[PDB]
Homo-oligomer: A and B are copies of this chain.
Protein backbone atom coordinates (compact mmCIF):
# COMPACT_ATOMS: atom_id res chain seq x y z
CA UNK A 1 0.00 0.00 0.00
CA UNK A 2 3.10 2.19 0.11
CA UNK A 3 3.12 4.90 -2.55
CA UNK A 4 6.88 4.54 -3.07
CA UNK A 5 9.73 2.54 -1.55
CA UNK A 6 13.34 3.64 -1.04
CA UNK A 7 16.11 1.23 -0.07
CA UNK A 8 17.68 2.14 3.28
CA UNK A 9 19.99 -0.84 3.86
CA UNK A 10 20.03 -4.57 3.12
CA UNK A 11 17.38 -5.36 5.74
CA UNK A 12 14.74 -2.62 5.85
CA UNK A 13 13.17 -0.29 3.29
CA UNK A 14 11.45 3.05 3.85
CA UNK A 15 7.92 3.79 2.62
CA UNK A 16 7.12 7.22 1.17
CA UNK A 17 3.53 8.49 1.07
CA UNK A 18 1.84 11.57 -0.36
CA UNK A 19 -0.53 11.96 2.61
CA UNK A 20 -0.03 12.52 6.34
CA UNK A 21 -1.51 9.37 7.91
CA UNK A 22 0.37 8.35 11.04
CA UNK A 23 3.67 9.75 9.76
CA UNK A 24 6.35 11.52 11.78
CA UNK A 25 8.58 13.28 9.23
CA UNK A 26 7.83 15.32 6.10
CA UNK A 27 10.38 16.27 3.46
CA UNK A 28 9.46 19.40 1.51
CA UNK A 29 11.20 20.24 -1.77
CA UNK A 30 10.60 23.96 -2.26
CA UNK A 31 10.98 26.23 -5.28
CA UNK A 32 10.72 29.93 -4.46
CA UNK A 33 8.92 32.21 -6.89
CA UNK A 34 10.93 35.16 -8.17
CA UNK A 35 11.10 38.01 -5.67
CA UNK A 36 13.45 40.99 -5.57
CA UNK A 37 14.44 40.16 -1.96
CA UNK A 38 15.12 36.42 -2.44
CA UNK A 39 18.53 35.26 -3.68
CA UNK A 40 17.93 31.48 -3.45
CA UNK A 41 15.76 29.57 -5.92
CA UNK A 42 15.19 26.14 -4.36
CA UNK A 43 15.68 24.50 -0.96
CA UNK A 44 14.64 21.34 0.86
CA UNK A 45 13.67 20.81 4.49
CA UNK A 46 12.69 17.99 6.84
CA UNK A 47 9.93 18.94 9.28
CA UNK A 48 8.73 16.95 12.28
CA UNK A 49 5.41 17.15 14.11
CA UNK A 50 6.70 19.94 16.37
CA UNK A 51 7.47 22.19 13.40
CA UNK A 52 11.25 21.86 13.76
CA UNK A 53 13.00 22.19 10.41
CA UNK A 54 16.33 20.76 9.28
CA UNK A 55 17.78 22.09 6.03
CA UNK A 56 18.76 19.40 3.52
CA UNK A 57 19.57 20.79 0.07
CA UNK A 58 20.27 24.24 -1.40
CA UNK A 59 20.60 23.43 -5.14
CA UNK A 60 24.18 22.23 -4.55
CA UNK A 61 23.29 18.76 -3.27
CA UNK A 62 22.93 17.40 0.23
CA UNK A 63 26.27 18.87 1.34
CA UNK A 64 24.61 21.43 3.62
CA UNK A 65 23.12 18.59 5.67
CA UNK A 66 26.49 18.17 7.39
CA UNK A 67 26.22 21.72 8.76
CA UNK A 68 23.15 20.61 10.77
CA UNK A 69 21.13 23.82 10.55
CA UNK A 70 18.01 23.46 12.70
CA UNK A 71 15.29 26.11 12.95
CA UNK A 72 12.17 26.34 15.08
CA UNK A 73 9.88 27.03 12.10
CA UNK A 74 9.88 27.36 8.33
CA UNK A 75 9.80 31.14 8.72
CA UNK A 76 13.11 30.92 10.57
CA UNK A 77 14.57 28.80 7.77
CA UNK A 78 13.52 31.48 5.29
CA UNK A 79 14.95 34.23 7.51
CA UNK A 80 18.34 32.54 7.87
CA UNK A 81 18.63 30.99 4.38
CA UNK A 82 16.95 32.76 1.46
CA UNK A 83 17.92 36.40 2.14
CA UNK A 84 21.28 37.89 1.17
CA UNK A 85 21.10 40.82 3.59
CA UNK A 86 22.15 40.46 7.20
CA UNK A 87 19.36 41.28 9.68
CA UNK A 88 16.21 40.05 7.98
CA UNK A 89 14.30 39.81 11.28
CA UNK A 90 14.77 43.55 11.84
CA UNK A 91 12.85 44.41 8.66
CA UNK A 92 9.80 42.13 8.80
CA UNK A 93 8.34 38.93 10.23
CA UNK A 94 7.09 35.95 8.24
CA UNK A 95 3.86 34.09 8.98
CA UNK A 96 0.97 32.39 7.23
CA UNK A 97 -2.25 34.38 7.53
CA UNK A 98 -4.45 31.24 7.61
CA UNK A 99 -2.47 29.48 10.38
CA UNK A 100 -1.37 26.79 7.92
CA UNK A 101 1.88 24.87 8.23
CA UNK A 102 4.03 23.92 5.25
CA UNK A 103 3.87 20.24 6.23
CA UNK A 104 0.87 19.71 8.53
CA UNK A 105 -1.66 22.39 7.41
CA UNK A 106 -4.05 23.41 10.23
CA UNK A 107 -2.98 20.67 12.64
CA UNK A 108 -1.84 20.98 16.25
CA UNK A 109 1.94 21.11 16.56
CA UNK A 110 3.48 18.97 19.28
CA UNK A 111 5.75 20.27 22.03
CA UNK A 112 9.46 20.85 21.49
CA UNK A 113 11.13 17.56 20.56
CA UNK A 114 14.50 16.54 19.17
CA UNK A 115 14.70 16.61 15.38
CA UNK A 116 15.94 13.57 13.49
CA UNK A 117 19.46 14.15 12.19
CA UNK A 118 21.43 11.82 9.89
CA UNK A 119 24.41 10.09 11.50
CA UNK A 120 25.47 7.11 9.40
CA UNK A 121 26.27 6.74 5.70
CA UNK A 122 23.01 4.83 5.21
CA UNK A 123 21.15 7.98 6.26
CA UNK A 124 23.11 10.11 3.80
CA UNK A 125 22.43 7.69 0.95
CA UNK A 126 18.74 7.63 1.88
CA UNK A 127 18.52 11.44 1.84
CA UNK A 128 20.34 11.57 -1.50
CA UNK A 129 17.83 9.12 -2.99
CA UNK A 130 14.92 11.04 -1.46
CA UNK A 131 16.14 14.37 -2.84
CA UNK A 132 16.59 12.92 -6.33
CA UNK A 133 13.10 11.41 -6.19
CA UNK A 134 11.59 14.69 -4.97
CA UNK A 135 13.37 16.65 -7.71
CA UNK A 136 12.03 14.20 -10.29
CA UNK A 137 8.41 14.77 -9.19
CA UNK A 138 8.74 18.53 -8.67
CA UNK A 139 7.94 19.46 -12.28
CA UNK A 140 4.51 17.77 -12.26
CA UNK A 141 3.14 17.54 -8.70
CA UNK A 142 3.38 20.45 -6.24
CA UNK A 143 1.17 22.86 -4.33
CA UNK A 144 1.25 26.56 -3.50
CA UNK A 145 2.28 28.00 -0.14
CA UNK A 146 2.20 31.67 0.86
CA UNK A 147 4.16 33.54 3.52
CA UNK A 148 3.38 37.15 4.40
CA UNK A 149 5.83 39.78 5.60
CA UNK A 150 4.33 42.53 7.76
CA UNK A 151 5.46 45.41 5.58
CA UNK A 152 3.36 48.36 4.43
CA UNK A 153 2.05 47.16 1.99
CA UNK A 154 2.43 43.49 3.00
CA UNK A 155 5.00 41.40 1.17
CA UNK A 156 3.95 38.03 -0.25
CA UNK A 157 6.30 35.11 -0.90
CA UNK A 158 5.01 32.23 -3.05
CA UNK A 159 6.49 28.74 -2.67
CA UNK A 160 6.00 25.65 -4.83
CA UNK A 161 6.14 22.71 -2.42
CA UNK A 162 6.44 18.97 -3.08
CA UNK A 163 5.81 16.99 0.10
CA UNK A 164 6.71 13.42 1.06
CA UNK A 165 5.73 11.87 4.41
CA UNK A 166 7.62 9.01 6.02
CA UNK A 167 9.05 7.48 9.21
CA UNK A 168 12.56 6.39 10.39
CA UNK A 169 13.23 3.15 12.28
CA UNK A 170 13.88 3.25 16.01
| Interface residues in A11-42 (C-beta closer than 8 Å to B) | 33, 36
A156 in contact with B158 given A143-B143, A144-B143, A145-B144 (CB within 8 Å):
yes
Query: From residue A65, how far is it (CB to closest CB) to chain B in Å?
Result: 28
Interface residue total, chain A, C-beta cutoff 8 A: 14
Contact residues, A101-121 vs B (CB, 8 A): 106
Give Cα A117–Cα B156 distance, bound, in whole angstroms. Answer: 37
| A36–B153 CB distance below 8 A | yes
Distance in angstroms between the alpha carbons of A160 and B146 in the assembled complex = 11
CA distance A106 to B156 in the complex (A): 24
Q: Are B143 and A158 in contact (CB under 8 A)?
A: no
What separation, in Å, do the CA atoms of A97 and B98 have in the docked complex?
24
Chain B contacts of A33 at CB under 8 A?
Answer: 97, 146, 156
Partner of A146, one of B106, B153, B158: B158
Cα distance, A69 to B97, chains bound together (Å): 32
Which residues of the partner chain B approach A98 to less than 8 Å between Cβ atoms? 160
